């Protein structure tokens, strides 16, 4: 997940769904029993990618 699109694909494989709940430049991933993950548009650097991965328990 150098990018938002790659992150979304990754999380989708792990059971997250992209909803319409996103706004502006962030999208919104939701999964039953988890607090949703909010993902920035475009390219994500090592900190952001890692933060989102840790949010997803991976």
């Amino acid at each position: 997940p150098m990018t938002q699109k790659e992150m979304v694909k990754l999380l989708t494989a792990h059971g997250w769904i992209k909803t319409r709940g996103g706004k502006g430049s962030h999208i919104k991933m939701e999964k039953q029993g988890e607090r949703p993950i909010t993902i920035l548009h475009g390219e994500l650097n090592k900190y952001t990618e890692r933060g989102i991965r840790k949010q997803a328990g991976l």
């Binding site: 319409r20 709940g21 996103g22 706004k23 502006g24 430049s25 962030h26 919104k28 607090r35 949703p36 909010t38 920035l40 475009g42 390219e43 994500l44 650097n45 090592k46 900190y47 952001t48 890692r50 933060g51 989102i52 840790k54 949010q55």
Partner: protein
Amino acid sequence: MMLVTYPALFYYDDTDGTEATYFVHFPDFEYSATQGEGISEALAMGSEWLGITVADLIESDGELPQPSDINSLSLIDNDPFKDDEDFVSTYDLDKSFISMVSVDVSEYLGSQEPIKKTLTIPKWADKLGREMGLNFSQTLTDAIADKKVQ
């Protein structure tokens, strides 16, 4: 408006993609992450991230965390990755700062799953509300969210 403010950490690393300069993290939200190219964009993206996150807390009737005291925060001690050994952070701490981030959650509240509701309000409220050119539906929705927040 419904204004919420949380302190955030702004970490400067312009290696690995300038435009990813300034990694943004809210200590009150575990592993929260967003980013922005300069200072203004970072704050803007932080606010946007915050708005979506807090709005979801409203809608799902979750708990809103109490904002941390900004003066007890530390770029070092509150580093979200400080402990996990896998990760090598390269922070420029001289360019990194701590700041408040505000957002109006009103703007981020979802309209999904519309329900039709018929009710009655007194004539003075109806005329007053229309003189201000209000959206009565949105006024009710906002008021409900506001009650939840407080």
